[PDB]
Design a protein around this ligand. Structure first.
Ligand code: HEC
Length: 80
């Protein structure tokens, strides 16, 4: 956990409690913490990228698979 975001380099904009170029993973988690499919949705935009729900900066695409996409929404959501 955690070390994963490094191998990818998502912190370049995201941030647990630091609203930087991207919505702090902690903030997004709470926003999707009251949901039940935050895993599919998130990962759905993780392998696609883009934007429109938090801003416009088309986040750069990534090379992850469904499984990896799950750990991202599961690891980012658990973060508060
Ligand atoms: C800055 C260039 C970014 C880097 C690097 C990464 N992400 Fe990102 N991400 C960024 C923004 C600005 C947004 C919001 C765009 C919008 O308006 O919606 C996002 C969003 C995500 C999301 C949300 C998916 C969703 O809710 O549909 C996820 C899951 C996400 N980003 C994952 C992610 C990962 C895994 C990264 C490293 C591989 C990563 N992002 C880098 C900006 C940036």
């Amino acid at each position: 956990n955690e070390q994963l975001a490094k191998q990818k380099g998502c912190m370049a904009c995201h941030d647990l409690k630091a609203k930087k170029v991207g919505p702090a993973y902690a903030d997004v988690a709470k926003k999707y913490a009251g949901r039940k499919d935050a895993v599919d949705y998130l990962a759905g935009k993780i392998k696609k990228g883009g934007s429109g729900v938090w801003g416009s900066v088309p986040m750069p695409p990534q090379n992850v698979t469904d499984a990896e996409a799950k750990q991202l929404a599961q690891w980012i959501l658990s973060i508060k």
